[PDB]
Write a protein that binds this ligand. Structure first.
Ligand code: F3S
Ligand code: F3S
Ligand code: F3S
Lengths: 63, 45, 322
């Protein structure tokens, strides 16, 4: 059974396609996250409707 | 009798077979209880 | 420091091991360290009445006896007369009584003298016992309360035989003013040698850690630890056999031989009963009956399963390669 668990763990030892390098986060407290979320909510219904105009601006920047 | 009633199970074949199988792996029971005793006397450690 | 070395139910293996001493070697110990070897059955020049004169002078206090080394068992048979060991006109046990009572320090060298050893194996025809122990039971021939004139109990230098350093370094310590550095464990063994285990320094401990077993003798011992299949008592045996190597070369365990736990008072363990020689007694075929010192079967087996799972590839391959 120990050899079975060794072969099982040894299979999981082979792993591919996963990147987790040096993740870090701080100073979001300094950001007015609550205010920015309120601002984003006031702006979200505008941003969603403005998406065709924003794309037409971006398309002219892709040239 | 109560005690002779268990003495009858002692001569009951299936009961006897199971008890003899318990006496077969008695060492394992002894070692697991010894292991538990050991673990208990090293529970502070 | 006068030394009288007597042999009771001995095979002289402690003497021979002692003669293998290096740093100091035996000659330098006897000459250059101020240890006056009054007599030794294997080395003393005196025979017959001259030897007996030396012995009687030591026993009666006519000349000082600083160290009485006793090798071999105290033979008490037949019927407590000790006549299965007649030495210099007396039962050896009578010599032991007198000289142990005369010595400043009494040193039992080898299991026979310390604990009874192999001759004390059942049926013990010679009525053999140790100086202050019979196997693990304290008291032996001299009684639990025996103290030499320096106040020490019998210093038990166990082993079968003792390694030369186990005695020579004690003798050097005594000769160099370091007697006070000598601490004895509960079996009166020098802790400077017997706090470690045989396993301490064993070349196979990594295999032990990963529960990789040597499977067979000879080339099979190029890998693995001997605990699981060969009854290695290394982890249950206090000794510096792998710290201070035998003959400055090796140890049983390094060489592929299981430690027989010879420094332990029960040696030979299980009295070499059938099925116990170079075999690990197991419960249900997989749990060793005896686990390492200070471990319990539950934790030991759990850790053993974990280690078997974690075992690296090299721990499963030959390592003591040609
Ligand atoms: S070496 Fe010999 S003297 Fe006794 S302690 Fe072992 S049988
Ligand atoms: S580590 Fe060595 S002392 Fe024995 S138990 Fe294994 S061969
Ligand atoms: S049998 Fe004895 S000599 Fe050392 S290797 Fe074991 S304690």
């Amino acid at each position: 059974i120990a050899n079975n668990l060794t072969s099982a763990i040894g299979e999981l030892k082979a792993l591919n396609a996963a990147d987790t390098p040096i993740p870090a986060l701080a100073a979001l407290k300094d950001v007015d996250l609550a205010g920015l979320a309120n601002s984003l909510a006031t702006l979200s219904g505008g941003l969603v409707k403005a998406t065709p105009a924003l794309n037409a601006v971006l398309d002219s920047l892709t040239d | 009798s109560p005690v002779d009633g268990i003495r009858r199970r002692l001569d009951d074949p299936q009961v006897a077979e199971a008890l003899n199988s318990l006496l077969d792996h008695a060492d394992l029971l002894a070692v697991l209880v010894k292991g538990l005793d050991g673990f208990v006397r090293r529970g502070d450690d | 420091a006068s030394v009288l070395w007597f042999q009771g139910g001995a095979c002289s293996g402690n003497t021979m091991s002692f003669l293998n001493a290096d740093e100091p070697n035996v000659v330098d110990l006897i000459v250059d360290f101020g240890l006056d070897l009054l007599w030794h059955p294997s080395l003393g020049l005196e025979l017959g009445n001259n030897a007996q004169k030396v012995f009687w002078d030591c026993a009666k206090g006519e000349r000082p006896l600083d160290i009485f080394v006793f090798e071999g068992t105290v033979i008490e048979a037949p019927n407590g007369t000790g006549q299965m060991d007649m030495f210099a006109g007396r039962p050896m046990k009578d010599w032991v009584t007198d000289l142990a009572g005369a010595a400043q320090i009494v040193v039992a060298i080898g299991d026979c003298a310390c604990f009874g050893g192999i001759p004390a194996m059942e049926p013990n025809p010679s009525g053999s016992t140790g100086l202050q122990f019979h196997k693990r039971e304290k008291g032996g021939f001299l009684g639990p309360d025996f103290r030499s004139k320096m106040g020490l109990p019998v210093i038990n230098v166990p082993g079968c035989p003792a390694h030369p350093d186990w005695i020579t370094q004690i003798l050097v310590a005594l000769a160099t003013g370091r007697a006070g550095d000598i601490t004895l464990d509960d079996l009166h063994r020098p802790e400077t040698f017997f706090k470690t285990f045989t396993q301490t320094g064993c070349t196979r401990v990594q295999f032990f850690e990963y529960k990789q077993s040597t499977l067979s003798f000879g080339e099979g011992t190029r890998t693995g630890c001997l605990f699981y299949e060969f009854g290695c008592r290394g982890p249950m045996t206090h000794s510096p056999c792998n710290r201070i190597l035998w003959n400055r070369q090796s140890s049983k365990t390094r060489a592929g031989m299981p430690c027989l736990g010879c420094t332990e008072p029960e040696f030979p363990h299980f009295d070499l009963a059938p099925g116990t020689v170079f075999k690990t007694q197991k419960v249900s075929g997989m749990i060793p009956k005896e686990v390492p010192e200070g471990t319990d079967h539950l934790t030991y087996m759990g850790l053993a399963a974990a280690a078997r799972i974690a075992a690296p590839q090299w721990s499963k391959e030959d390592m003591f390669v040609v």
